[PDB]
Amino acid sequence: SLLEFGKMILEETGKLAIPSYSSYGCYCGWGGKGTPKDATDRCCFVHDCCYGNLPDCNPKSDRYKYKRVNGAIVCEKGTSCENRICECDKAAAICFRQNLNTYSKKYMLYPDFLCKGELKC
Numbered sequence: 001s002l003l004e005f006g007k008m009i010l011e012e013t014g015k016l017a018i019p020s021y022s023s024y025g026c027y028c029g030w031g032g033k034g035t036p037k038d039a040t041d042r043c044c045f046v047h048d049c050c051y052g053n054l055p056d057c058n059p060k061s062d063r064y065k066y067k068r069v070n071g072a073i074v075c076e077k078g079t080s081c082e083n084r085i086c087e088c089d090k091a092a093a094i095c096f097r098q099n100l101n102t103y104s105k106k107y108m109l110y111p112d113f114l115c116k117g118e119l120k121c
């Protein structure tokens with residue numbers, strides 16, 4: 001669920017999920033169409049794609065638990081929907097962490113019309 005994810009994001013990047021990530025590029029937060037504008041945008045894209053493989057789960061409201069083994073994010077045994085979700089968020093977390101150095105503000109609050117193009121997961 002978002003609470004977990006957001007907290008995971010803050011620990012990892014030091015930036016707050018909302019609003020640093022709720023309206024970035026074409027895929028962070030609003031999902032939908034387009035060509036990811038950048039690495040972070042791709043992270044979000046691969047992430048939306050991750051929730052896409054769990055049709056009958058509820059990434060948003062289902063809560064899972066995770067811990068840190070020295071800085072490592074470690075998803076704890078829960079329902080199977082819970083485990084698979086958590087893996088999906090961990091990746092996004094890492095991913096964001098891996099491209100902080102190219103996180104660009106001109107993609108904050110990006111207008112929808114500039115998000116057209118095709119991309120299959």
Ligand SMILES: COc1ccc2c(c1)c(CC(=O)O)c(C)n2C(=O)c1ccc(Cl)cc1
Nearest residue numbers: 029031048049051052055056057058059060
């Ligand atoms: C590729 O992108 C997707 C696809 C489906 C999604 C989401 C993101 C998010 C993610 C979001 O809002 O960031 C949620 C919550 N999805 C569903 O609940 C869902 C539920 C029931 C059926 Cl039968 C099919 C899909």
Ligand SMILES: CS(=O)(=O)Nc1ccc([N+](=O)[O-])cc1Oc1ccccc1
Nearest residue numbers: 002005006016017018021022029030060
């Ligand atoms: C899930 S939605 O319809 O895509 N809204 C939404 C998108 C991103 C985030 N977030 O924390 O990164 C949080 C989000 O929603 C909330 C807004 C305020 C308080 C709690 C959740």
